[PDB]
Design a binder for this molecule. Structure first.
Ligand SMILES: CSc1ccccc1CC(=O)N1CCC[C@H](S(N)(=O)=O)C1
Ligand SMILES: [Zn+2]
Length: 140
């Protein structure tokens, strides 16, 4: 579990969105595994606006933050799960790092701010849904 709290937005994995998230929906995209809902309180996270390929992510199944090198946002086949059919997830970045199913939501960050959240992984991989292209998270 986990979310990004920037401005009056809450960014979560679409597959982990709550009823309250759906009832206060701003934007969602199944192909990216992302959903954004509106919040009453202002958040403290800042979004990175860069092309970094090195950063640090939080792994809840180890209670640890790990430095990682990650690929550029791309399309990558993600194996069928209880949440989506076998398919091409977009804007996804891969790294070598420990991950297990409930780690979705952990933040990946670089020197510029939050880069994205854990969405996939496996056999020593972890994948992140990028948010750096969502410029509207910084305003209104
Ligand atoms: C950290 S996820 C993980 C880790 C180790 C092993 C397996 C997984 C599960 C995983 O890859 N899933 C299941 C939840 C839905 C995502 S997604 N990206 O939204 O299609 C895909
Ligand atoms: Zn950066």
């Amino acid at each position: 579990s986990g979310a990004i709290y920037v401005g009056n937005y809450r960014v979560v994995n679409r597959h982990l969105a709550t009823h309250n998230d759906w009832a206060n929906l701003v934007w969602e995209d199944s192909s990216r595994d992302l959903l954004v809902s509106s919040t009453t309180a202002q958040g403290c996270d800042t979004i990175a606006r860069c092309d970094c390929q090195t950063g640090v992510y939080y792994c809840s199944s180890r209670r640890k933050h790990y430095p990682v090198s990650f690929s550029k946002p791309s399309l990558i086949f993600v194996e069928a799960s209880e949440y989506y059919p076998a398919r091409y997830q977009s804007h996804l970045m891969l790294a070598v790092g420990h991950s297990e199913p409930g780690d979705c939501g952990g933040i990946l960050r670089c020197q510029h701010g939050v880069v994205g959240i854990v969405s996939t992984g496996g056999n020593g991989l972890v994948g992140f849904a990028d948010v750096r292209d969502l410029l509207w998270l910084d305003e209104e």
